[PDB]
Write a protein that binds this ligand. Structure first.
Ligand SMILES: [Mg+2]
Ligand SMILES: [Mg+2]
Ligand SMILES: [Mg+2]
Ligand SMILES: [Mg+2]
Ligand SMILES: [Mg+2]
Ligand SMILES: [Mg+2]
Ligand SMILES: [Mg+2]
Ligand SMILES: [Mg+2]
Ligand SMILES: [Mg+2]
Ligand SMILES: [Mg+2]
Ligand SMILES: [Mg+2]
Ligand SMILES: [Mg+2]
Ligand SMILES: [Mg+2]
Ligand SMILES: [Mg+2]
Ligand SMILES: [Mg+2]
Ligand SMILES: [Mg+2]
Ligand SMILES: [Mg+2]
Ligand SMILES: [Mg+2]
Ligand SMILES: [Mg+2]
Ligand SMILES: [Mg+2]
Ligand SMILES: [Mg+2]
Ligand SMILES: [Mg+2]
Ligand SMILES: [Mg+2]
Ligand SMILES: [Mg+2]
Ligand SMILES: [Mg+2]
Ligand SMILES: [Mg+2]
Ligand SMILES: [Mg+2]
Ligand SMILES: [Mg+2]
Ligand SMILES: [Mg+2]
Ligand SMILES: [Mg+2]
Ligand SMILES: [Mg+2]
Ligand SMILES: [Mg+2]
Ligand SMILES: [Mg+2]
Ligand SMILES: [Mg+2]
Ligand SMILES: [Mg+2]
Ligand SMILES: [Mg+2]
Ligand SMILES: [Mg+2]
Ligand SMILES: [Zn+2]
Lengths: 206, 155, 60, 80, 127, 24, 118, 98
RNA sequence: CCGGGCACUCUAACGGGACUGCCCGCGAAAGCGGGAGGAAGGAGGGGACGACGUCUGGUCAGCAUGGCCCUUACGGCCUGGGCGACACACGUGCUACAAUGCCCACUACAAAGCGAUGCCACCCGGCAACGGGGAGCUAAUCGCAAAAAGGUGGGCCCAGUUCGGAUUGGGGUCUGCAACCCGACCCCAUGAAGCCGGAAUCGCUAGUAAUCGCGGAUCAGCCAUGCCGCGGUGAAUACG
């Protein structure tokens, strides 16, 4: 019972908030609720489109929802079609007249939440988890990324007893907050149970 | 003190005499962190002890604390079953601490109503060679010279 | 918690006293922070995520 | 030390019921699930059954017990 | 003319101005003995001037604020020290061997959770 | 001391006001 | 110094010595010393026969006092006891009334501890 | 009197926006008193770490709202030529009271 | 308070500063003892941070979840009641048993927070809780606000008391639809045990223990003496 969340540690230095705006006593609550609704919608629909981060900014009734995608072709859609429906459905929930923004993320294997989603996918179809783990750590290690680490939860391969998986490489020092350690969590819901997937990725120094 | 020697705290000098033993005694009188009230106690006792007997409270204080300091005591040592009372000498620092503690505890075990009066009369009796603090000291010394048959267990 | 037990959201409590906080995300029954509208567990997780601006690691 | 401080609160439920019962003569057992209300003078002489939470217990209401509440005479607890 | 020393002790600030005079020291519209009336350690505030033989050679005006009056006294001490040094730097030779130029950095320590006051642990009985 | 509610210290411990501890 | 139904304080301050009367505490003693025009800090022995008689005039008949007060309180107990009130039941069984917990520390109202086995 | 109350959750953002405003106003106006810092409103929240006790494990976070003041003196036009809308920072928040 | 000014304390953003660098000593080295200089040193003080794993530790009663049971029914609404029960037993605490004390006037010095019907200066009424009126503060400007121990003055005189406030009778305010079960608070009266605690056992090595008040979250109200922070004064001792 230890090892608090790494991004919560990192929020101050070498990490930034997923929502950066200002509010007061009378506004913060339902604005945060609106942010949660936005992220909820985008996790309902855009899961298979390869999305990693949703950064929401507000100046004054202006919304700047920024979706970082591993495949922007599914977000934009053919002729822009899909940036019409769910960009309107986005405004059919909040009456704030909000516009949507897309951005490219290179090396989907370099973003920890994307790697978590990938390993969770391969787990849901019941691959041998250790191969997915080591292969993911190599995908990370084959492009910079001076450290990489993967943890999987219990009931591996459908086993009755719960276990714990492993096989990090390089150097992943969660203790020290210096060098932009990224983290992602995924949830594989299968017939035998639920498997948590924690992807730690270490890159850069200062 | 498993690793270090636990270096002794060096108390601040006193504002009236300029002596450190006075500050130590005033600390021993203090309770709940009231050094102001304790200083007032000790200094009203100083006035009372300088008036009721026409001597300097400095040397009477010093002579009383010197009279209460014991030269031997007993410590329990586990040997061959239940432990035994083994006599031994005393450190000068521990003599100081024990003398001041016995002074305060015998002063507050006195009948006198006001605290300063208790302090003053206790210091007087201790400076004369009698009183309760010197009685406790001489009982400590009477523990020695009594179980001296264990003088081969000094350690 | 229980869906119906968020009946506070339609407040109409028949009496002004029966309003309780009922943390929005987790539907907390007991311990809810009014300023965030969340509960200590939901607040902990959401501040870990980084979705609450200005929230840092307190240390002094 | 008990206080209601102005417009001593009596629920409408038994209020209108008993002020209309008095007009036709004394009635027999009444039904009471509202022990929150205060006793008023004109209640004397009736027989009021109050709720323990489980049971219905009758209470003879007299002049002496006017200032108190309905429920002082219906013990919730059961011991020995 | 006039020389300045600030000093600081346990959340207290005592601006000290020193000039020549008779030895009359005032604080916040009160004399030094009326504002600190009946405090046994109030004499330690003018202690730093006893290695320089002031109080008849000097004169002072002090404005103090914050904390408690004991911290005020010790901040007055330190401020007098720095004013004395800015007056005559040679006084350092007689000051630091006494220790009057050192900022006392002992601060009240913050309270920690799981404790009563920052170190006292709650008592358990029958472990 | 602090438990005596009709004295001033018991009033400041409970933080209340009354005849034995008027506000001002 | 006889003031009320039998009551004789002595050798103390008057306002303090009036607390020894049943229906008089510090507040009523200060009120008596106030409206009777008597120095509170006076000793009991130094009280004038006129000062004592005025204190008797006031204290005797302005509030109900020792015997009347004891009987009034006890008869109030009997009054809310003969009615079937819950408060009367708490007075009957010898348990606290003000609405405290009785699982632990009901000692003052329930008397010394009688420890059954377990 | 043109009071510009600056508030934010980020201190470097406040410094950036305020210094940009003052640099814009320094090419037109007076000896401007400039960027005064105000005390920060600190909201602390202590939360028991684990659900379903372990009471004595709680950790706390702190939000802090920083405040800055500008107080431009005698600006007429060229100051507000570089003022209407030119700023990058998002988390910053600006108010104007006169 | 004004004119005015930033030097000062301050507020808050970036920096400087400590590195065994200098010297003596010892040593093969790290390093150790001592000294100067310095605000500060040998990790300057305090946090945040808790390794591979352990105890089949803790909660599916936060959440999410794999299986097994429920369906006019465990689901669902509402009223009342309950979680507050008492012949007992332990845990954690609060207040105390007093004269270094209690009470009464008078007066001085904190930091950290909180407040748009929310905090509520001020006038009036009331012994009071509180009520009426009403100013200001979108709060380094207003308000909570008085800090408390302390200082001087006074009374108490070793006594179950001017210690201690439990219990109980009566009167009364307030939040609230509503205080019988079962709230806090004010006033009058009642004024219990307790006069330093058996075996045993607990916390703390420096601003620490001890003591003193203040604030906060949750909350209409509050059974908070809890919890989480803040500063005031300020020890004793460590042979080993
Ligand atoms: Mg993920
Ligand atoms: Mg596998
Ligand atoms: Mg890092
Ligand atoms: Mg569920
Ligand atoms: Mg609630
Ligand atoms: Mg509620
Ligand atoms: Mg501190
Ligand atoms: Mg403290
Ligand atoms: Mg425990
Ligand atoms: Mg009393
Ligand atoms: Mg707890
Ligand atoms: Mg001006
Ligand atoms: Mg300058
Ligand atoms: Mg050295
Ligand atoms: Mg040295
Ligand atoms: Mg040195
Ligand atoms: Mg350190
Ligand atoms: Mg450090
Ligand atoms: Mg450190
Ligand atoms: Mg570390
Ligand atoms: Mg387990
Ligand atoms: Mg279990
Ligand atoms: Mg489910
Ligand atoms: Mg309970
Ligand atoms: Mg039984
Ligand atoms: Mg005021
Ligand atoms: Mg301002
Ligand atoms: Mg001001
Ligand atoms: Mg302002
Ligand atoms: Mg006196
Ligand atoms: Mg007795
Ligand atoms: Mg008494
Ligand atoms: Mg006694
Ligand atoms: Mg230690
Ligand atoms: Mg509250
Ligand atoms: Mg209660
Ligand atoms: Mg409190
Ligand atoms: Zn929740």
């Amino acid at each position: 019972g230890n090892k608090i969340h790494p991004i919560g540690f990192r929020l101050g230095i070498t990490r930034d908030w997923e929502s950066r705006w200002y509010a007061g006593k009378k506004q913060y609550r339902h604005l945060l609720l609106e942010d949660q609704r936005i992220r909820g919608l985008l996790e309902k629909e855009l899961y298979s489109a390869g999305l990693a981060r949703v950064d929401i900014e507000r100046a004054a009734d202006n919304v700047a929802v920024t979706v970082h995608v591993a495949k922007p072709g599914v977000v934009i859609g053919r002729g822009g079609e899909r940036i019409r429906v769910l960009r309107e459905e986005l405004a059919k929930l909040t009456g704030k007249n909000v516009a949507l923004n897309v951005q490219e993320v290179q090396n989907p294997n370099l973003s920890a939440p994307l790697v978590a989603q990938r390993v969770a996918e391969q787990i849901e179809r019941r691959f041998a988890v250790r191969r997915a783990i080591k292969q993911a750590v190599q995908r990370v290690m084959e492009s910079g990324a001076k450290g990489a680490k993967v943890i999987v939860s219990g009931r591996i391969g459908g086993a009755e007893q719960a276990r714990t998986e492993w096989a990090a490489q390089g150097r992943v020092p969660l203790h020290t907050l210096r060098a932009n350690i990224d983290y992602g969590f995924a949830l594989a819901r299968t017939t035998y149970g639920v498997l948590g997937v924690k992807a730690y990725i270490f890159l850069g120094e200062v | 003190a498993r690793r270090r020697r636990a270096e002794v705290r060096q108390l601040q000098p006193d504002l009236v005499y300029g002596d450190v033993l006075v500050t130590a005694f005033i600390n021993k009188i203090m309770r709940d962190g009231k050094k102001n009230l304790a200083a007032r106690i000790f200094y009203d006792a100083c006035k009372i002890i300088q008036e009721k007997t026409g001597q300097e409270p400095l040397k009477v204080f010093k002579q009383a604390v010197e009279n209460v300091k014991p030269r031997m005591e007993v410590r329990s040592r586990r040997v061959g079953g239940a432990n035994y009372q083994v006599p031994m000498e005393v450190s000068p620092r521990r003599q100081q601490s024990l003398a001041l503690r016995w002074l305060v505890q015998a002063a507050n075990q006195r009948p006198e109503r006001r605290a300063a009066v208790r302090i003053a009369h206790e210091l007087m009796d201790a400076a004369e060679g009698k009183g309760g603090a010197v009685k406790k000291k001489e009982d400590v010394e009477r523990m020695a010279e009594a179980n001296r048959a264990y003088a081969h267990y000094r350690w | 918690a229980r869906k119906a037990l968020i009946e506070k959201a339609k407040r109409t409590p028949k009496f002004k006293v029966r309003a309780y906080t009922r943390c929005v995300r987790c539907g907390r029954a007991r311990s809810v922070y009014r300023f965030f509208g969340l509960c200590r567990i939901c607040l902990r997780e959401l501040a870990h995520k980084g979705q609450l601006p200005g929230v840092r690691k307190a240390s002094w | 030390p008990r206080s209601l401080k102005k417009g001593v609160f009596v629920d409408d439920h038994l209020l209108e019921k008993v002020l209309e019962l008095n007009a036709k003569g004394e009635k027999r057992l009444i039904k009471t699930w509202s022990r929150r209300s205060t006793i008023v003078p004109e209640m004397v002489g009736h027989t009021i059954a109050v709720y323990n939470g489980k049971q219905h217990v009758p209470v003879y209401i007299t002049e002496n017990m006017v200032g108190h509440k309905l429920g002082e005479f219906a013990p919730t607890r059961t011991y020995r | 003319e006039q020389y300045y020393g600030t000093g600081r002790r346990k959340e207290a600030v005592a601006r000290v101005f020193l000039r020549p005079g008779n030895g009359k020291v005032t604080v916040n519209g009160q004399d030094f003995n009326e504002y600190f009336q009946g405090l046994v350690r109030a004499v330690a505030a003018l202690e730093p001037l006893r290695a320089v033989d002031a109080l008849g050679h000097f004169d002072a005006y002090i404005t103090v604020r914050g904390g408690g009056k004991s911290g005020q006294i010790d901040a007055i001490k330190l401020g007098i020290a720095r004013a004395l040094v800015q007056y005559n730097p040679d006084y350092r030779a007689k000051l630091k061997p006494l220790g009057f130029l050192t900022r006392d950095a002992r601060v009240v320590e913050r309270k920690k959770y799981g404790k009563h006051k920052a170190r006292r642990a709650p008592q358990y009985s029958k472990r | 001391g602090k438990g005596d509610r009709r004295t001033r210290r018991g009033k400041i411990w409970r933080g209340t006001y009354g005849k034995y501890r008027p506000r001002k | 110094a006889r003031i009320a139904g039998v009551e004789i304080p002595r050798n103390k301050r008057v306002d303090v010595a009036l607390t020894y009367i049943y229906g008089i505490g510090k507040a009523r003693a200060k009120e008596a010393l106030e409206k009777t025009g008597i120095n509170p800090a006076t000793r009991v022995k130094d009280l004038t026969e006129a000062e004592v008689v005025r204190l008797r005039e006031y204290v005797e008949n302005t509030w109900k006092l020792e015997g009347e007060l004891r009987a009034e309180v006890a008869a109030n107990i009997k009054r809310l006891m003969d009615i079937g009130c819950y408060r009367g039941l708490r007075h009957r069984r010898g348990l606290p009334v003000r609405g405290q917990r009785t699982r632990t520390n009901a000692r003052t109202r329930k008397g010394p501890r009688k420890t059954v086995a377990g | 009197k043109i009071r510009i109350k600056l508030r934010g959750f980020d201190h470097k953002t406040l410094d950036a926006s305020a210094q940009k405003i003052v640099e814009a106003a320094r090419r037109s106006g007076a000896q401007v008193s400039g960027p005064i810092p105000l005390p920060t409103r600190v909201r602390r929240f202590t939360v028991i770490r684990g659900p379903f006790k372990h009471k004595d494990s709680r950790e706390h976070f702190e939000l802090r709202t920083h405040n800055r003041l500008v107080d431009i003196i005698n600006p007429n036009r060229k100051t507000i030529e570089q003022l209407m809308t030119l700023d990058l920072p998002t988390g910053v928040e600006i108010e104007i009271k006169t």
